[PDB]
Amino acid sequence: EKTHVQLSLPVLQVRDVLVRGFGDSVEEVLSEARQHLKDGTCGLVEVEKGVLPQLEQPYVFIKRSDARTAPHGHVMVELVAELEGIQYGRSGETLGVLVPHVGEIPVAYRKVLLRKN
Numbered sequence: 001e002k003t004h005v006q007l008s009l010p011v012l013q014v015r016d017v018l019v020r021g022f023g024d025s026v027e028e029v030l031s032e033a034r035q036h037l038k039d040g041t042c043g044l045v046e047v048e049k050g051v052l053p054q055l056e057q058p059y060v061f062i063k064r065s066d067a068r069t070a071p072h073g074h075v076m077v078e079l080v081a082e083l084e085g086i087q088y089g090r091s092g093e094t095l096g097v098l099v100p101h102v103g104e105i106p107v108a109y110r111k112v113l114l115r116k117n
């Protein structure tokens with residue numbers, strides 16, 4: 001497994017998302033997020049007012065992991081989970097919140113260089 005992988009994630013509007021989180025514990029949501037990333041079944045919801053209360057906790061965020069540079073168009077990112085106000089991981093700015101993708105029509109694709117850790 002290389003340390004990072006280039007992915008193009010479908011960006012979903014929150015009201016379209018059918019499965020509003022990955023599971024019921026921090027460890028489960030991180031595990032499931034990683035599996036859906038592997039399978040090409042992970043979407044991204046950009047955070048704006050009203051978005052997080054419409055999604056299910058624990059949340060999985062992708063956050064920016066370096067400023068140096070975004071290789072080949074793909075922002076370098078890592079996963080950080082949140083439950084009841086506590087975060088598991090420390091990283092940079094949030095690009096969005098990951099959710100299962102089950103065929104919803106995206107509004108854009110977001111290119112990222114994902115750290116697998």
Ligand SMILES: Nc1nc(-c2ccc(O)cc2)cs1
Pocket residue numbers: 001005033034035037038039116117
């Ligand atoms: N070849 C590819 N590997 C992945 C991947 C692999 C491992 C993870 O933990 C998360 C994503 C996505 S695409």
